[PDB]
């Protein structure tokens, strides 16, 4: 039906494990099918590019590698801590993700 | 007493005999079967309880005897089972067939007959038959037989 | 292989 992404494009997340543990950055892109996310400036890898149009002189380019979506915790826009997401039901009937440490919404 | 301590007594769980698993076993190769007979084959011999190699067997050369019965089968008649006095020694007051089924002495569906082996006791004994001996012992001891029918 | 060529007959040791 859907792959459970606790994290969405655009919100600020903390990388909690691996060579980049501690880093903080915005979710640039969520790849559900692979259960992974790209975090800005995290998981930098060198990639060989053939000499061609768009890459004359060729060589290598810096690219941001995908991170297992489990290695990522959203930073709460209110209390500023990393946190698990809860589900709060508005009176409207809608449902938003809400931080657990404090109580703020993360949209 | 913990699980690591739970243990069958010596000799309660014997190991099995495995044939056809090598020369050291003493049971390998021919698998304790000898060489090359009907009996060595899979399927083996005919019923070694009856078959005698083709000749007339020692059971089938014996004569039959008595009525074997015929269709439509058994004839329903009253069946009697005996109970000796020495069996009744455990009861007091009265004895009936219905009471002796529960002791496990008289089968169900059989009629009660008391027999003479033992010592009679001053008891009320209700039963479908009595021995010549059981009657004499029972009277001479103060008991009361009650031939029902 | 699927097909067996027939073997030669024997010499008639009769």
């Amino acid at each position: 039906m859907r792959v459970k992404m606790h994290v969405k494009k655009g919100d600020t997340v903390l990388v909690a494990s691996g060579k980049y543990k501690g880093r903080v950055g915005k979710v640039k892109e969520v790849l559900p099918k692979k259960y992974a996310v790209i975090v800005e400036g995290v998981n930098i890898v060198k990639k060989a590019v053939r000499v061609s149009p768009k890459y004359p002189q060729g060589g290598f380019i810096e690219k941001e590698a995908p991170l297992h979506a489990s290695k990522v915790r959203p930073i709460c826009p209110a209390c500023g801590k990393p946190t698990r997401v809860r589900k709060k039901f508005l009176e409207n009937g809608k449902k938003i993700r809400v931080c657990a440490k404090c109580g703020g919404a993360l949209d | 007493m913990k699980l690591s301590d739970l243990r069958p007594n010596p000799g309660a769980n014997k190991r099995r005999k495995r044939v056809g698993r090598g020369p050291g076993s003493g049971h390998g190769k021919t698998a304790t079967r000898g060489h090359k007979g009907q009996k060595s084959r899979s399927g083996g011999l005919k019923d070694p309880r009856r078959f005698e190699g083709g000749r007339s067997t020692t059971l089938m050369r014996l004569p039959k005897r008595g009525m074997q019965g015929q269709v439509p089968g058994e004839i329903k008649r009253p069946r009697y089972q005996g109970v000796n006095l020495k069996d009744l020694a455990r009861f007091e007051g009265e004895v009936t067939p219905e009471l002796l089924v529960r002791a496990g002495l008289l089968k169900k569906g059989y009629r009660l007959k008391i027999l003479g082996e033992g010592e009679a006791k001053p008891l009320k004994v209700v039963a479908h038959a009595f021995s010549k001996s059981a009657l004499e012992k029972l009277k001479a001891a103060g008991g009361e037989p009650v031939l029902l029918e | 292989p699927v097909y067996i060529p027939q073997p030669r007959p024997p010499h008639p040791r009769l």
Partner: protein, 49 residues
């Protein structure tokens, strides 16, 4: 027999929960020490009479 007490105790790695109608020897031997209701000791005493 108390459902609430077996609820409270179930999740602990060191506690095997059991109703009295359920007392078997394997569970008794699996465990180091035994703890019973007076109500449950009544059932154990009944089933060995």
């Amino acid at each position: 027999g108390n459902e609430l007490v077996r609820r409270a105790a179930r999740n602990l790695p060191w506690v095997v929960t059991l109703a009295p109608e359920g007392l078997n020897v394997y569970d008794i031997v699996r465990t180091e020490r035994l703890v019973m209701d007076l109500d449950a000791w009544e059932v154990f005493q009944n089933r060995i009479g």
